[PDB]
Design a protein around this ligand. Structure first.
Ligand SMILES: NC(=O)c1ccc[n+]([C@@H]2O[C@H](COP(=O)([O-])OP(=O)(O)OC[C@H]3O[C@@H](n4cnc5c(N)ncnc54)[C@H](O)[C@@H]3O)[C@@H](O)[C@H]2O)c1
Ligand SMILES: NC(=O)c1ccc[n+]([C@@H]2O[C@H](COP(=O)([O-])OP(=O)(O)OC[C@H]3O[C@@H](n4cnc5c(N)ncnc54)[C@H](O)[C@@H]3O)[C@@H](O)[C@H]2O)c1
Ligand SMILES: NC(=O)c1ccc[n+]([C@@H]2O[C@H](COP(=O)([O-])OP(=O)(O)OC[C@H]3O[C@@H](n4cnc5c(N)ncnc54)[C@H](O)[C@@H]3O)[C@@H](O)[C@H]2O)c1
Ligand SMILES: NC(=O)c1ccc[n+]([C@@H]2O[C@H](COP(=O)([O-])OP(=O)(O)OC[C@H]3O[C@@H](n4cnc5c(N)ncnc54)[C@H](O)[C@@H]3O)[C@@H](O)[C@H]2O)c1
Ligand SMILES: O=P(O)(O)OC[C@H]1O[C@H](O)[C@H](O)[C@@H](O)[C@@H]1O
Ligand SMILES: O=P(O)(O)OC[C@H]1O[C@H](O)[C@H](O)[C@@H](O)[C@@H]1O
Ligand SMILES: O=P(O)(O)OC[C@H]1O[C@H](O)[C@H](O)[C@@H](O)[C@@H]1O
Ligand SMILES: [Mn+2]
Ligand SMILES: [Mn+2]
Ligand SMILES: [Mn+2]
Ligand SMILES: [Mn+2]
Lengths: 440, 442, 428, 441
């Protein structure tokens, strides 16, 4: 009910225009006082801010915009801080994907040796974001972080800053039930699923469209066509997410207990992913020539006074799900979202420091995670491997240990051998000088 | 959208006219096809049914009322079963309280040896209620059980019938929240608290009115006056002098242990000395409700049969009916209401065993309860729950395995019982007084 | 092997003449270079030391005796320190038992409010003994502590000094094993039992003499005459009859039947006064008769399997003999249904590097609930020592079974604070 | 008392060795009769010939009995030493052939080959237990040292929890033999702390006569591995594979510097180096056909003709002595501290209860008393948890007759790089093990 200072950490992001409009679509419920754009790359944010200035003009010209690179200005009296940083940028992302494919391992943004490399670049910058809000922001601030790797960052931030008023979320589960809703002619607001596992490492146990269970109806379709549908093709315009949503067919057919997350293709079938990818045109290269080009081109058109199509960025359930989390934090709406919380008994046969991705009711005081219970053996063993992998990686950043990171690389299902882990690790240390913590 | 068949298991209860009116007040949200009153005592239920018909005639005359003692006719195609049975009746309640006071122990309805005795009378009759609904009722039935002892029956029903579509609740925390509403001059709708422990064995960690945390302000008042305010005296529950003494005893407990606001029933566990002296062997609490709540509900039955006018607002008091109807209503429309229910732990409270039936906040869905991950509790409250959970656990094993030694272990474990020697003299006294109600113990 | 420096922490104890002789009997295995007596009451230690040298020269007059009160003197290059201290002495034990009987509670040395009060006196003096040896003693020293209350001391010292080279034992399980052997006509060295629980809070699950299990024959006799045989003890016949699974520890007569003990105890003549005018007075009169040249009987102190059990643990630490004993150890999964920081009393193999406890497994519900209550009771009392909290000490008093209510617990704790000023830590 | 000793699997190549090491303790083991039981009648009698001349040269007063009847061999049996290899030494070859056909490691106990070998031995082991509970002495003991000990011990405990069985393995003792040869220490004075699964553990501390030598061993093993100069003289180092396995541990000990690794970690941590090293037309299972199995059938033919046999070629290795010491400890209650396989149940706190871990324990006359070792670090918890789930899912596939549980188990295994490869390996193992594997719907 109070005027709120909304701060976007990483204003120069390609998702910034879409986030703002989805935040402006909920104006009558979120009392925006000042919309702040914060970033460490000034000239990059200035170009993206010109689109935000046009998104504000076309949707709500009364919203006051603020752009800065000083953390004191951006975070002083900050009420809600939606974090979406990419440490190193997309240029460092293709470096992670090239080194992995050079050694024959999968090169992904969040999975495999690439995601582990991206993680240790984001651990300490995220903690610095925590300390910024603890010093300057409101005493009851909130950091709705959806920057990747969510599994490693949430595990690192919980062990380093346990008292941080933070909520780590991901939209990949929301994107899957967006596909699941179209398979059934169901509307996305009427969908709801039970879920467990780590980030990019979970399963849909039960699905229901408006209270009526559905899991069997979806299981039959996904095992035959995957998460694609005849209406899905109308994000599905991207020729790479059509491969991911289709790849869920073989996984859901071999293991028939639950409906799988699309990120299981990189762990269950890494040999097929390696042959599918191309080191000369990695996914990061595909978005530099795609999403990032179309947002720089739109910034140049605004400078040239030419009309821009602002609906390029108003796509996906990405922005809608994040604003709902903020909206539930403001009015205590008790929204049930698949968020990432410390376990501490939520899943009994898992460790306490494990950051599981489970359903929880978003209160104004934080997430109230639902007690899930015990999980089967096949899913405990997979999570125990990744949880130890992520845990050894965090401990490598805390202790500045080379062996701890080497142990974490060997633990990953992507890395096939202890010898490959050492050769992959030594290449990342060379390519992350100035980003990674120094290992001894 | 679907017409529902609501069955009140135990229609001859003193709370039956209350919850019937509280159920009729939600007529737009609960589509009542028929209202069924089931009981094993035909004559007692027919007298209460006279008042239920008078309540129906006053609030909603379009609701058809069916009264029966046949379980197959009562539970066939049943949609929602609200259990409020008292195995042995108030007759056995005064005998449990008198036997305890005869041995210098706290004789309470649900706490101490009287509660454990009342529990063993209710285990198998509750299981028979479950098998009735599994066999006769709808495949999506729900048993909103609020019969006591809710702690023992929930742990027993979960072990014997784990697949039962049952939800065990209690109004004692809600009644405490009503007092906290009066102390703060806050509306009960705006109240919400964090809570953990067992039934009649819990603690309020945080309490907030309209989202604003008011725990520190409440414990300031409770430490000096207890759960009693000057506006609390105006309501109907605080008319009973036993409830005034019961709420005002929380001042000592909230002053010695300053972490949380205690549940009211800690009066008998933490202070059995001050309770054995306060109670009267010749006028126990069960005797008081016989000369009070039970007397005034069978008087109104005779007044109805004599044409004299009956004051129906006698039984419309308390948050008893309002809380139980809200649970069923949240089961029908999937309202996701956050209530303090009794669920199997299974990691909800990490320091406790899996089969511990803890009383924690949960969201009532049309599929059951989704309990929130409470986490770890400090040492002083773990050790207290570990003792009672072992006590209640050994008592459930005594009913299943028919073991006399497990029952002696259950009585020895309880905090009310001072020694194992008193536990045997009390147990053997309960064996004879409950011949016909208890399971055989070899 | 190496000539070792044996130190007795508490030379003014009434047990010192017995421990010394039991240690001299194993002189062929324990290479003693000099026997030390450490204490803080040099007036009391010098009188008991007169009995020691007379025990020395009547058993082995070639070992060197040393009597000092300087902590650096006694613990420098010390290889084995045998702690038997009693903080407050026997003059405060009588006050712990009188205060409990003032409120109608169990007035015992180690069980109830008397035990918790005694435990709060021994925590920090024990920590100081640890820090004395960590800097002055040998880097592989071993502290064999058997000073009560072992349950509260072992839990407090393990949380405060986790890396302490300490072994907490108790002869009460061995004394029961002695009376068991007398029932079965068995040699004490041939008896061996499986055991679990807290110190003075455990049970005998299986007992065997010469390999043959004799549990059923024992509990037949113990249910009739208790642990007493034809060749406190007799009270265990009721406990073994009401609960038929295991053979109980004798100390369960205070927790399972507290009010029955209160009717048996006389406040004007407590147990601590029986030893004042009994064991303690026979030690000082013996030292008095030694000072006057009167011939003394040194065999009156040689009684008991008390000293022989503690020497056996030390000998097993020296030569790595793998002696299986009932030792108080940190749980950490030895009993699954108990917390990690629970100090369980389970059989373990005494090695040259410490005790290797056997994995016991899960215990049934009735014994878990009783242990969980006492473990939380002792855990809260230890937290009251570290955090200096009056509410934590009140919580621990309320948790104890022998306390009828929290009302009596507050009146009981307040009386203990009045009588233990100078021994207890501050409680805000 | 007089004891009836039964060797389950008399046709084994280790039968003459364990008989020699059993007769060396004839004063500590009162042997009433020595029984050789097996299902292969023709194979056992040939191996029984060597056993007849072993007893002739050592203690000709021992009564020898051969049979193929379980009621004859197991009635009144006091101690049974499990030694079976169901399917034979040639089904082992096809395990190591199919694995290398898909580019995976082909090992007797590790990878898809060991999981396949395990599924063959689960129900035969359950039948051996039910044979003894029904026929043998009421206080019988089964000293099981037949592989895969990890999967068998987990399956036998979940199916027969009250079985009087003790699962052991000489691999830690074979390493302890090598460690003793590096430090000029005697094997009787060696003693080590150890945790993990069977062929999946780590040596945390090592002592020679009670003095820690772990840092001194790490200095040598990180350079030459478990290979030393005195080790070469031993008969096991004359095999070219057992030298490559003991020197391969140099890298694993150099990368993970916490503990000394079990030599079987080369198959889990290095599936690239092993598949490159293995020859598909001459696997380890083939090297024992024309190697160990040829030297024992040569000796069996030498006896029936009259030619005197050299029996000391079967009298090498810590395998037999370590097994006889365990059974001797059960008879006289010697409390021998051995590295055995027991149900966890809190022994390793941060592991599941049904996990069968390999930890030190004191062998009494009533079973093994394992020591409480506590929690293990994160890197070693995650590795064991993955293998524990792998072996757990494989045991469930045997009990529940589920094809999906088997596919889940083959996918969890570290040596299998993909679910696609896990499905292709499982389908080939099903066809090759028809009649040995249970049905998988
Ligand atoms: N979890 C999910 O479901 C999900 C979905 C989409 C995007 N994301 C995350 O969104 C982020 C942005 O993606 P993008 O394609 O727009 O990236 P981008 O590289 O185009 O932009 C990232 C922005 O972050 C800024 N930044 C970098 N380090 C920073 C720091 N320490 N503090 C503040 N700002 C910093 C950069 O300067 C840049 O402006 C990534 O972390 C991505 O993984 C996550
Ligand atoms: N959960 C709580 O906090 C809470 C609050 C109020 C009441 N209660 C419980 O409500 C119940 C009723 O209280 P009351 O004072 O109105 O009781 P009451 O004695 O006046 O009436 C109880 C009724 O139950 C019937 N009954 C007994 N055994 C039965 C069986 N096996 N099947 C069906 N009906 C059976 C009796 O015949 C009688 O009609 C008690 O169990 C009481 O403890 C619980
Ligand atoms: N656990 C068992 O099985 C077992 C058996 C018998 C006795 N005990 C305990 O062992 C101890 C034996 O002593 P006792 O009963 O003969 O009493 P005691 O009073 O005769 O001797 C205790 C000695 O401890 C000394 N002391 C006090 N504070 C000290 C400190 N800080 N450092 C060193 N010495 C200190 C005293 O001055 C005195 O000399 C007592 O605590 C007794 O209860 C335990
Ligand atoms: N400590 C260890 O872990 C260790 C050490 C050495 C050998 N082993 C195991 O020893 C076993 C034997 O090795 P080997 O090379 O001598 O084998 P082998 O092939 O030479 O002999 C195995 C014998 O088992 C018999 N057999 C098969 N099924 C049987 C059944 N159901 N009951 C009884 N006997 C049966 C066969 O007929 C054959 O005679 C293998 O399982 C091997 O892995 C393990
Ligand atoms: O019947 P009474 O003794 O008045 O009890 C009144 C009731 O108060 C609350 O509702 C408690 O939760 C019940 O357990 C109790 O029965
Ligand atoms: O001191 P007493 O009354 O003689 O007690 C006899 C001794 O035996 C008990 O078992 C305790 O271990 C000692 O604390 C006690 O001193
Ligand atoms: O490869 P092989 O010659 O058959 O020997 C293999 C054997 O050697 C190791 O030392 C292990 O102790 C055994 O478990 C294994 O089966
Ligand atoms: Mn994501
Ligand atoms: Mn109640
Ligand atoms: Mn003692
Ligand atoms: Mn082996």
């Amino acid at each position: 009910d109070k005027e709120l200072k909304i701060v976007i950490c990483g204003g120069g992001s390609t998702y910034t225009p879409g986030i703002v409009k989805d935040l402006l679509d909920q104006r009558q419920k979120i009392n925006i006082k000042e919309l702040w754009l914060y970033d460490i790359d000034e000239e990059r944010q200035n170009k993206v801010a010109l689109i935000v200035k046009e998104v504000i003009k076309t949707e709500a010209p009364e919203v006051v915009l603020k752009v800065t690179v000083n953390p004191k200005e951006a975070f002083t009296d900050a009420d809600y801080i939606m974090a979406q940083m990419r440490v190193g940028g997309l240029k460092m992302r293709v470096k992670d994907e090239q080194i992995c494919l050079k050694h024959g391992c999968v090169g992904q943004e969040t999975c495999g040796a690439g995601g582990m490399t991206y993680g240790m670049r984001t651990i300490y910058p995220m903690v610095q974001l925590i300390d910024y809000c603890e010093e300057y922001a409101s005493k009851k601030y909130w950091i709705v972080n959806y920057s990747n790797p969510a599994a490693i960052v949430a595990k690192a931030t919980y062990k380093l800053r346990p008292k941080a008023r933070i909520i780590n979320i991901c939209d990949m589960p929301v994107e899957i039930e967006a596909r699941m809703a179209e398979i059934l002619d169901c509307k996305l607001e009427d969908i709801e699923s039970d879920y467990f596992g780590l980030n990019h490492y979970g399963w849909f146990t039960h699905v229901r469209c408006k209270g009526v269970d559905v899991t069997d109806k979806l299981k039959e379709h996904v095992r035959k066509y995957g998460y694609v549908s005849e209406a899905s093709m109308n994000l599905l315009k991207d020729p790479d997410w059509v491969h991911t949503f289709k790849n869920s067919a073989l996984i859901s057919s071999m293991f028939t207990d639950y409906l799988p997350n699309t990120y299981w293709q990189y762990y269950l079938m890494p040999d097929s992913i390696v042959d599918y990818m191309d080191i000369n045109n990695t996914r990061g290269m595909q978005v530099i020539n795609g999403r990032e080009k179309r947002i720089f081109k739109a910034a140049e058109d605004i400078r040239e006074g030419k009309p821009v199509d602002l609906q390029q960025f108003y796509v996906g359930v990405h922005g809608k799900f994040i604003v709902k989390v903020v909206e539930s934090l403001i009015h205590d709406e008790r929204s049930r979202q698949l968020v990432i919380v410390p376990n501490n008994g939520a899943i009994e046969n898992l460790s306490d420091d494990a950051t599981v991705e489970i359903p929880g009711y978003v209160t104004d005081r934080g997430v109230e995670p639902v007690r899930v219970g015990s999980i089967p053996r096949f899913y405990k063993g997979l999570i125990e491997q990744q949880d130890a992998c992520e845990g050894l990686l965090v401990e490598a950043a805390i202790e500045h240990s080379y062996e701890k990171a080497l142990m974490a690389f060997t633990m990953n299902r992507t890395i096939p051998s202890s010898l490959v882990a050492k050769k992959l690790l030594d290449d990342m240390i060379e390519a992350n000088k100035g980003y990674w913590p120094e290992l001894k």
